[PDB]
Design a protein around this nucleic acid. Structure first.
Ligand SMILES: [Mg+2]
Ligand SMILES: [Mg+2]
Ligand SMILES: [Mg+2]
Ligand SMILES: [Mg+2]
Ligand SMILES: [Mg+2]
Ligand SMILES: [Mg+2]
Ligand SMILES: [Mg+2]
Ligand SMILES: [Mg+2]
Ligand SMILES: [Mg+2]
Ligand SMILES: [Mg+2]
Ligand SMILES: [Mg+2]
Ligand SMILES: [Mg+2]
Ligand SMILES: [Mg+2]
Ligand SMILES: [Mg+2]
Ligand SMILES: [Mg+2]
Ligand SMILES: [Mg+2]
Ligand SMILES: [Mg+2]
Ligand SMILES: [Mg+2]
Ligand SMILES: [Mg+2]
Ligand SMILES: [Mg+2]
Ligand SMILES: [Mg+2]
Ligand SMILES: [Mg+2]
Ligand SMILES: [Mg+2]
Ligand SMILES: [Mg+2]
Ligand SMILES: [Mg+2]
Ligand SMILES: [Mg+2]
Ligand SMILES: [Mg+2]
Ligand SMILES: [Mg+2]
Ligand SMILES: [Mg+2]
Ligand SMILES: [Mg+2]
Ligand SMILES: [Mg+2]
Ligand SMILES: [Mg+2]
Ligand SMILES: [Mg+2]
Ligand SMILES: [Mg+2]
Ligand SMILES: [Mg+2]
Ligand SMILES: [Mg+2]
Ligand SMILES: [Mg+2]
Ligand SMILES: [Mg+2]
Ligand SMILES: [Mg+2]
Ligand SMILES: [Mg+2]
Ligand SMILES: [Mg+2]
Ligand SMILES: [Mg+2]
Ligand SMILES: [Mg+2]
Ligand SMILES: [Mg+2]
Ligand SMILES: [Mg+2]
Ligand SMILES: [Mg+2]
Ligand SMILES: [Mg+2]
Ligand SMILES: [Mg+2]
Ligand SMILES: [Mg+2]
Ligand SMILES: [Mg+2]
Ligand SMILES: [Mg+2]
Ligand SMILES: [Mg+2]
Ligand SMILES: [Mg+2]
Ligand SMILES: [Mg+2]
Ligand SMILES: [Mg+2]
Ligand SMILES: [Mg+2]
Ligand SMILES: [Mg+2]
Ligand SMILES: [Mg+2]
Ligand SMILES: [Mg+2]
Ligand SMILES: [Mg+2]
Ligand SMILES: [Mg+2]
Ligand SMILES: [Mg+2]
Ligand SMILES: [Mg+2]
Ligand SMILES: [Mg+2]
Ligand SMILES: [Mg+2]
Ligand SMILES: [Mg+2]
Ligand SMILES: [Mg+2]
Ligand SMILES: [Mg+2]
Ligand SMILES: [Mg+2]
Ligand SMILES: [Mg+2]
Ligand SMILES: [Mg+2]
Ligand SMILES: [Mg+2]
Ligand SMILES: [Mg+2]
Ligand SMILES: [Mg+2]
Ligand SMILES: [Mg+2]
Ligand SMILES: [Mg+2]
Ligand SMILES: [Mg+2]
Ligand SMILES: [Mg+2]
Ligand SMILES: [Mg+2]
Ligand SMILES: [Mg+2]
Ligand SMILES: [Mg+2]
Ligand SMILES: [Mg+2]
Ligand SMILES: [Mg+2]
Ligand SMILES: [Mg+2]
Ligand SMILES: [Mg+2]
Ligand SMILES: [Mg+2]
Ligand SMILES: [Mg+2]
Ligand SMILES: [Mg+2]
Ligand SMILES: [Mg+2]
Ligand SMILES: [Mg+2]
Ligand SMILES: [Mg+2]
Ligand SMILES: [Mg+2]
Ligand SMILES: [Mg+2]
Ligand SMILES: [Mg+2]
Lengths: 80, 86, 107, 122
RNA sequence: UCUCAUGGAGAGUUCGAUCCUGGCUCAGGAUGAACGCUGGCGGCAUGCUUAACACAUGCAAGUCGGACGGGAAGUGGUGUUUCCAGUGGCGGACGGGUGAGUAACGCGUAAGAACCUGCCCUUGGGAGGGGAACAACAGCUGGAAACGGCUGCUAAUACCCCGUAGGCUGAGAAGCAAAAGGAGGAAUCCGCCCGAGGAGGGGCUCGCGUCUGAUUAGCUAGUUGGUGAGGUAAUAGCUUACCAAGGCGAUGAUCAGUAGCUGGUCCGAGAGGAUGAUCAGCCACACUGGGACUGAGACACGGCCCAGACUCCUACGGGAGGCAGCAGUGGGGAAUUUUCCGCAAUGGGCGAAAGCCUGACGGAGCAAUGCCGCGUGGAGGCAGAAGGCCCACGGGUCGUGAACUUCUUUUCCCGGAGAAGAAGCAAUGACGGUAUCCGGGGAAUAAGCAUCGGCUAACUCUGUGCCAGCAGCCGCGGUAAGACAGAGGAUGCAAGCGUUAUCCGGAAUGAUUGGGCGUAAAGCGUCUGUAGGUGGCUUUUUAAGUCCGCCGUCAAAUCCCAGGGCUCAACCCUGGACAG
């Protein structure tokens, strides 16, 4: 199914993730439908674009744990 | 998209016609335009169209190993009917 | 004894057994369909009145549908195929009766 | 010239023709020497040139030049050959890399040593 | 003198000289590069292009005891809890590899209508009553092994029947079809069956674009269409019978040859040329060929069946196997790495969860393969000495260069402390005691390689004498060689420097922009003319080109602009856009 998850970019030892809406059977960095959020542990930079997230969650998109909890902190699950 | 106007080369077969479509294209290197002519097997139930006709060509489901196209009455054309001379 | 190939062996055996089941379910359809067709030839050629002879025929027909849909929901067939089989039986049943003469839609 | 004619494809390029076919698109090739001998150069250049016929991995047989001063090379020796043309000798399109495989480095050459495969003196 | 432009260089060589036409050659960039000499460090990348040739060993796909019957470890026992073959459930169709085949709707792009869809959402109804088996197990038995054979035996979310069904068949009449329980003390949860939607993933169909060959000219008969019967998830010569004679083709069919394609990469002033490694999408393949089965999904890399070729085991009666998965060995080759660590991160699979498995991935190691950063000292140093070399013997030059005196410690060495990366309950880090930070020594641990005739920056001397040798082209070398070899000196780049190979450039040398044809290569011997291309003036029409506005899209990464982050840069990240 459609899954909203992290796709890993940046370089060796320094990791930065995009949060993307993509069919679950594509590869981890593979092609996708929409880019939505942005994330990173070291700079502690996190932010998302909420209308997109909601539009995908509406059509049944499953998030993955890390992503799920990111959406929790930004309160996207309450509006739902 | 835009349907293809052409003229009929061969009416002989049943419920079909053989249309020639001429379209112009600006040749990729040398920028002049050229006429490229292609042929089509067009499905025409009722066999209304004869040889020489000018017919519009429409798209639909495959009716055979070839004909994808429905033969349709000419869409718009300048009337060859005489006009006033003011 | 400890045997390790799950995927390989197990899926193999399962495939066999399920295959036998499927084979049965299809054969049934081919069969009952065939009886229907023999009955239809027997009827188209000779002269009865269908009001009388449609009774054995429709008993066979109903049996056939039963076999079909039982094979759909048991899952050896895909429903859209079933539709075609039934449609065929119906068509033959419609062909014979125009030959003998009771019904003829025209518009 | 005429556009109409250019659209019949009247411009076609001349492909690049290699100078060392026997190499088959490689920097070097290893070969065995069939024969070692000398040849005289095209006049007015007279001298005696050191050349060996080499049979290669790509199957060809060619004639290649041996640079430097003096050599130990003899038949059934495995050398390494490289490209480049000697204007002197007719037909000779290949050199022999010195200092690798069976061709030793030139003895007692002190300058531009890398061309001849010579260690640096301490 | 506003605006636009950040871009187009030549040189040698035919002659006794000249001008020209014309080729050859050089200066520049780029490598998945190799070889030679030399080699201190770090940052980010890259690493079988050839034989889609063989493969020893180990690992790369399983999970669920909360579907189920058993038996085996303990425990005193069915209070506790573990493992486990077996039946069932989903997953093994994704992920990983390679480019052989494929000139095709295979790919890119844009459209369409006749379809399918497990898991995920959204929603409308339901889950009655029975019955029969089969493994496991048991006993007997055949086998060296692999794996079997009889007879009993048994459970289920596994099989079969009956009842009911907003669905299916049908003009209708009518006809036909479903279920499964498991958790919990209950509430309730995860499921099951039938419809109806949604999103995503697939199947088809069509316009356009999609290599060289005319010393390949006719090719095609299920071939091009029509009906009738079949078949497919769905349209269709997909199949078959009959009817008709079409379909494609000099604008290049057919045949042969080469090739995975595209985002892109390299070059170019631009117009465009060459190419498709890493990175991302799609196709195609899995020892060589052919089949199907299971299934939402395959004609299935670590599944089945057969034939073939080849390797192994055998107690010779028979079996086992498929690295173009990660490493690794042989072989081929100029050439391309460790039989490493870990599931901690991200991503997958199964599960109620605990959790388990993941050679995807995250990391390490090896290698100057490449791009980028830093170093190998800084300041002063009689103008006196040793030495090399040149010298008209006056002196010049290596040379402020060294020696020598002070300052500094990036790097080196010896000790200390030491992350973020981990996600909101704590816990949990393979990397790693690494990155970084503090102290203690001490100029201490660290420069080579091409070239010096012209293009081309940089010159003299000894040694040789058409010899030995050099050379990218012109061409040097027969006694004083600025062209060979040595020395000293200088120049260019610098942890690299050269040589060879490949591609574009310069090349206006295949020319649209941008050439020519009286004598330099080049006007058919001359007409007639078919296709084809262009075609006088005036008014109107239409709007195919053309032009302008607006919308959709041309994936992300790359290039361009603007900021931000690793001390800088390379690299990474955000946002945005001209082209076309
Ligand atoms: Mg944090
Ligand atoms: Mg011109
Ligand atoms: Mg060239
Ligand atoms: Mg002349
Ligand atoms: Mg001369
Ligand atoms: Mg010229
Ligand atoms: Mg160069
Ligand atoms: Mg070395
Ligand atoms: Mg290969
Ligand atoms: Mg093995
Ligand atoms: Mg393991
Ligand atoms: Mg348990
Ligand atoms: Mg367990
Ligand atoms: Mg369960
Ligand atoms: Mg218990
Ligand atoms: Mg078990
Ligand atoms: Mg068992
Ligand atoms: Mg696969
Ligand atoms: Mg794959
Ligand atoms: Mg890879
Ligand atoms: Mg190929
Ligand atoms: Mg071909
Ligand atoms: Mg297409
Ligand atoms: Mg095409
Ligand atoms: Mg396709
Ligand atoms: Mg299923
Ligand atoms: Mg319900
Ligand atoms: Mg029931
Ligand atoms: Mg029933
Ligand atoms: Mg059932
Ligand atoms: Mg319980
Ligand atoms: Mg209970
Ligand atoms: Mg549904
Ligand atoms: Mg191409
Ligand atoms: Mg036929
Ligand atoms: Mg140019
Ligand atoms: Mg590769
Ligand atoms: Mg790929
Ligand atoms: Mg396949
Ligand atoms: Mg093989
Ligand atoms: Mg096969
Ligand atoms: Mg099936
Ligand atoms: Mg498989
Ligand atoms: Mg197969
Ligand atoms: Mg394998
Ligand atoms: Mg066999
Ligand atoms: Mg076999
Ligand atoms: Mg097997
Ligand atoms: Mg391997
Ligand atoms: Mg080897
Ligand atoms: Mg070898
Ligand atoms: Mg290497
Ligand atoms: Mg994990
Ligand atoms: Mg995980
Ligand atoms: Mg789950
Ligand atoms: Mg491991
Ligand atoms: Mg990796
Ligand atoms: Mg090292
Ligand atoms: Mg390095
Ligand atoms: Mg190093
Ligand atoms: Mg090297
Ligand atoms: Mg550097
Ligand atoms: Mg100094
Ligand atoms: Mg210090
Ligand atoms: Mg530092
Ligand atoms: Mg914590
Ligand atoms: Mg220190
Ligand atoms: Mg000069
Ligand atoms: Mg020289
Ligand atoms: Mg060269
Ligand atoms: Mg002389
Ligand atoms: Mg002398
Ligand atoms: Mg002399
Ligand atoms: Mg003298
Ligand atoms: Mg010299
Ligand atoms: Mg010197
Ligand atoms: Mg180099
Ligand atoms: Mg050119
Ligand atoms: Mg030319
Ligand atoms: Mg000319
Ligand atoms: Mg002449
Ligand atoms: Mg002439
Ligand atoms: Mg003439
Ligand atoms: Mg003439
Ligand atoms: Mg003639
Ligand atoms: Mg004429
Ligand atoms: Mg004419
Ligand atoms: Mg005209
Ligand atoms: Mg005009
Ligand atoms: Mg893009
Ligand atoms: Mg910038
Ligand atoms: Mg900065
Ligand atoms: Mg961007
Ligand atoms: Mg546009």
């Amino acid at each position: 199914m459609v899954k909203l998850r992290l796709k890993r970019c940046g370089r060796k030892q320094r990791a930065v993730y995009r949060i993307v809406a993509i069919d679950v059977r594509s590869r981890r960095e593979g092609r996708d439908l929409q880019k939505v959020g942005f994330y990173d542990p070291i700079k502690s930079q996190t932010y998302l674009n909420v209308p997109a997230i909601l539009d995908f969650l509406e059509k049944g998109a499953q998030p993955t744990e890390t992503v799920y909890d990111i959406l929790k902190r930004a309160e996207v699950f309450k509006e739902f | 998209m835009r349907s293809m106007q052409g003229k009929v080369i061969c009416a002989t077969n049943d419920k079909t016609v053989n249309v020639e479509v001429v379209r112009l294209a600006p040749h990729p290197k040398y920028k002049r335009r050229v006429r490229k002519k292609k042929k089509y097997q067009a499905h025409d139930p009722d066999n209304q169209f004869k040889v020489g006709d000018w017919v519009q060509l429409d798209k639909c489901r495959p009716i055979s190993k070839t004909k994808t196209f429905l033969a349709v009455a000419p869409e718009g054309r300048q009337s060859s009917a005489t006009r006033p001379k003011p | 004894t400890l045997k390790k190939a799950d995927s390989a062996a197990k899926r193999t055996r399962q495939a066999e057994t399920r295959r036998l089941r499927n084979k049965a379910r299809k054969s049934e359809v081919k069969t009952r369909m065939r009886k229907v067709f023999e009955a239809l030839d027997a009827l188209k050629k000779k002269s009865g009145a269908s009001t009388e002879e449609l009774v054995p025929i429709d008993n066979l027909i109903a049996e056939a549908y039963s076999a079909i849909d039982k094979a759909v929901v048991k899952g050896t067939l895909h429903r859209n195929t079933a539709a075609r089989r039934k449609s065929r039986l119906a068509r033959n049943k419609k062909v014979v009766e125009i030959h003998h003469g009771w019904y003829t839609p025209s518009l | 010239p005429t556009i109409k004619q250019l659209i019949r494809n009247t411009r076609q390029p001349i492909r690049n023709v290699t100078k060392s076919p026997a190499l088959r698109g490689c920097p070097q090739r290893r070969g065995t020497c069939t024969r070692v001998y000398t040849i005289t150069p095209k006049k007015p250049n007279s001298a005696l040139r050191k050349v060996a016929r080499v049979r290669l991995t790509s199957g060809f047989e060619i004639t290649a030049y041996i640079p430097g001063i003096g050599h130990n090379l003899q038949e059934h020796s495995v050398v390494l050959v490289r490209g480049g043309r000697v204007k002197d000798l007719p037909g000779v399109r290949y050199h022999i890399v010195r200092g690798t495989l069976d061709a030793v480095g030139v003895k007692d050459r002190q300058q531009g040593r890398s061309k001849y495969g010579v260690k640096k003196p301490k």
